[PDB]
Swiss-Prot record, chain D:
Residues of the full protein shown: 569 to 630 of 630
Cysteine disulfide links: none
Protein task: The pyruvate dehydrogenase complex catalyzes the overall conversion of pyruvate to acetyl-CoA and CO(2). It contains multiple copies of three enzymatic components: pyruvate dehydrogenase (E1), dihydrolipoamide acetyltransferase (E2) and lipoamide dehydrogenase (E3).
Active site: H35, D39
Protein family membership: Belongs to the 2-oxoacid dehydrogenase family.
Protein name: Dihydrolipoyllysine-residue acetyltransferase component of pyruvate dehydrogenase complex
Length: 247, 247, 247, 62
């Protein structure tokens, strides 16, 4: 366009500097993020789900499977993936991709979910196939195997494609809320922060509930505010009462 | 520019797909949103107003007008519109529009407010003229008539123009906070989520207050952070103590 | 590109209007903000720090220095600057600048911090040099002198250059959260809202703590979500327990 | 003029709310009017409207 150029200031006049290059993966990620930011309008919706029975049941399952000797660890991100898959089942519009020209929408019938995994080189997004037709134990085992593979830096190109709903979990570091960036060709992305014990009004007095904040960014060209609010409310209801996964 | 092209991935290799076209209104809305996102820098400010006397007085007015037989329903969005009109009266800068070249600012003396109305085809923004010179009952009656007209899909082009401050209310669906997108030629936009009973510190101990979260997006080219903070604080004060509407 | 043009609507057909020009500084600021918005993807992270001992110790220092007669006022923004400098010391990546082509990163060894100061013409960002090698009293005195100079409108060009981490404080106006815009060539920017007495769970029951909300915007091309979360968590820990400034 | 309103001194009086008396700052208001044009019912309605507006000032916008 006709914008001003990037400010070029000689940083060596204020102190010592050290100019270094960037890796190929970093450059590709930066270019993709810039393109997504300049091509996708983001409308982040924030919410807080009540996760008290889910965490207790997860710890109960872990302590009851330790006795049975299974070497399987169950994480809340598995339940988040299940809730996301259920919400995608209920609303097929979020499980789609907008074309380059923005005139044709390619709806998807399958549900494959990407998961943000921390690595010494940054973050990776391995994709799990068919999350709506798998159990908690199988998903946990696959997640453990994929995390072990990623932390060793051996992920292949076939496990990095086919995603439909990236989930970014950063609850182990901090933050109470953050707005992620939708990555093409996906339409929506869900971010999870750290869970905190907050007072919640039940009707008579406040009670301590383990609230988990969830943010949801989406492309405003395909999804409006009402649909995003309904989608995040469905996710909130599924996470607060996991028993809805069978109902 | 020189960005990477949109990722083209054959989605048919992972499962069944169904490609469908988009309507003219959807395409126009998407193009407008994309242009606004790539031309308007958004600086969303979040706040929570204390609405306990306002809701109680609204229900009191409804129950006292049911006896008088008026067939008029009073909604909190009417009070939100009145507060927005008062804030626009106090600060004329938000009631304006920036030119295409970004060098000339067209200040406005009139106050017409757009309202987000849910329809089976999405969201519409009918505009109410002269909100600063109308009463609560008249505004409620006009809002009911406009909502009935919109839900029937009979809105005309003359009722979709002249707005100065779009208000997006999604409290009936969910979300605790969301950042809307400013639509040209408007400068600011206000989003309203769902009201929740939260503990508020009065000076001695926490008390349950019905807090309503409000977000405010605006163009950073014309409005800076301080002016936006003052504007949203004025709205917060007007909504928390509605008696300021006459003072 | 091929976006739709800016909507041109004759505003004189709805009421009185008054078209006015914009100042040179306003135009330059708007152009810079537009360029930063269209070139830098923003990923805002929100957090709330527990500031109860820091505020009490600040008021204690003020009341104990009033007796000694020093004519020095201590503000929490000084402690925020110290925490930011410590975090930049711990993580040199945030104290850098990305080149125009996005392939070379110029790391910085010095720490100069910009501060948002309110003026009748808007907001200014004077830069303080070497914040990691100065005391609280010296920083407070320099801040008072700079604020007095700025409110008189006598800031020079030499005091407006060399910054590495702009801090925007708007706690004296309102808002519970806001997402600022990163200004080139800086990588990250921190925004501070108003502190509120909120209930915090300690392990047995909620206690009133003076929580201060802090937002952090950064360029996603250089900083990912995990690094930003770690950085804001380090700032949160430094602000909640200021005694870490020596440890 | 047809009517005239007189205002005296406000006093803290006990008012029954439904369960027990509470102290409320009551203000006495008198209203004289010409009986040729205004009857008792219209004057009572007018003074009741004034009473409702003064007791709940938020009605000034409603």
């Amino acid at each position: 366009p006709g914008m001003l150029p990037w400010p070029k200031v000689d940083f060596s006049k204020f102190g010592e500097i050290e100019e270094v290059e960037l890796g190929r993966i970093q450059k590709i990620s930066g270019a993709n993020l810039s393109r997504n930011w300049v091509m996708i309008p983001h409308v982040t919706h924030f919410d807080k789900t009540d996760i008290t029975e889910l965490e207790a049941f997860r710890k109960q399952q872990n302590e009851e499977a330790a006795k049975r000797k299974l070497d399987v660890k169950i994480t809340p991100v598995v339940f988040i993936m299940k809730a996301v898959a259920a919400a995608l089942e209920q609303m097929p519009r979020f499980n789609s991709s907008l074309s380059e020209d923005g005139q044709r929408l390619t709806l998807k019938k399958y549900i494959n979910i990407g998961v943000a995994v921390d690595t010494p080189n940054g973050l990776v997004v391995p994709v799990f196939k068919d999350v709506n037709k798998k159990g908690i134990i199988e998903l946990s085992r696959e997640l453990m195997t994929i995390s072990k593979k990623a932390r060793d830096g051996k992920l292949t190109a076939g496990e990095m494609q086919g995603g439909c709903f990236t989930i970014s979990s950063i609850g182990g570091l901090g933050t109470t809320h953050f707005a992620p960036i939708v990555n093409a060709p996906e339409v929506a992305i869900l971010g999870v922060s750290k869970s905190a014990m907050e007072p919640v009004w039940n009707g008579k007095e406040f009670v301590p509930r383990l609230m988990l904040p969830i943010s949801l960014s989406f492309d405003h060209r395909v999804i409006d505010g009402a649909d995003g609010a309904r989608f995040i409310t469905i996710i909130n209801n599924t996470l607060s009462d996991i028993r809805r996964l069978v109902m």
